[PDB]
Amino acid sequence: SAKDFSGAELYTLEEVQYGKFEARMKMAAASGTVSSMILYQNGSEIADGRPWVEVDIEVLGKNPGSFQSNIITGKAGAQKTSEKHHAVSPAADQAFHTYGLEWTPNYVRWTVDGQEVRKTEGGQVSNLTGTQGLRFNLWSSESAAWVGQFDESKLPLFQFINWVKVYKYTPGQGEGGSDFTLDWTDNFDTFDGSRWGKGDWTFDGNRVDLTDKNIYSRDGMLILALTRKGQESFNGQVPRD
Ligand SMILES: [Ca+2]
Ligand SMILES: [Ca+2]
Ligand SMILES: [Ca+2]
């Protein structure tokens, strides 16, 4: 649209209340970029007084060896946040890792390759009311302090998603008596339009227009691309997981 760069956002058409969410991915990273997996209550961004409900995993480009976790509550223009950082090894853009988010009435948990890196309870959790959809996005932030100055010479960049698993919150009824039960898996052999949407919008602080042109399906993976406007393409080699 009106911006000079093109990014991408894969989002579930449906939203859910609570659950466990896993995504097998190799993230993108260069100074200035944001490569993510998030839970998001659609409409949170509307400043009409309604609450903001969001849980994040965001690889900040200048620091590929870690990701920032966050929970955003409060409301548009007055967000309450809780940014923390977690080391990832090998670096997020150097290997596939399984990223997990668990959201229940009592806590939000973040896992990497099955290991807990963060568990939050309390106020913000009590305010993650309603439903959230699962999304993945690749963009560039104008806050250099947050992600580093944007190095356009590193473009194009790609985030690869091998598969996604979504589990329903079934307290005390999952396997081994756990609290989750697998609901569905998407192996990304194709782009399933009955399950996912491709974003076509932008927001303040984002120097890219999220576009459906930058979501590709190849060799069993879903690819999100960050490119200069007018150079939207993927010709490279899809990595092996
Ligand atoms: Ca620059
Ligand atoms: Ca796959
Ligand atoms: Ca769209």
Helix content: under 10%
- CATH top level is Mainly Beta
Order of helices and strands: EEEEEEEEEEHEHEEEEEE
Distance between the termini: 34 Å
Molecules bound to protein? calcium ion
CATH fold-level topology: Jelly Rolls
Strand content: over 45%
Overall structural class, as computed from helix and strand content, comes to mainly beta
Catalytic activity: Hydrolysis of (1->4)-beta-D-glucosidic linkages in beta-D-glucans containing (1->3)- and (1->4)-bonds
Domain GH16: 3-172
EC number: 3.2.1.73
Organism: Fibrobacter succinogenes (strain ATCC 19169 / S85)
Describe the structure.
By secondary structure, the protein is mainly β. The chain has one domain: Jelly Rolls. It is built from 2 helices and 17 strands. The protein has helices at residues 123-126, 144-147; strands spanning 5-12, 19-26, 33-40, 54-60, 66-75, 78-80, 84-87, 97-103, 108-112, 115-120, 133-140, 157-169, 180-186, 196-198, 208-210, 215-218, 221-228. The chain has a 17-stranded mixed beta sheet that branches. Strand 8 (97-103) and strand 9 form a beta hairpin. The protein is globular, with a radius of gyration of 17 Å. The protein binds calcium ion (3 copies). One calcium ion (CA) is lined by residues 149-150, 152. One calcium ion (CA) binds at residues 149-150, 152. It is classed as hydrolase. Keywords: 1, 3-1, 4-beta-D-Glucanase.
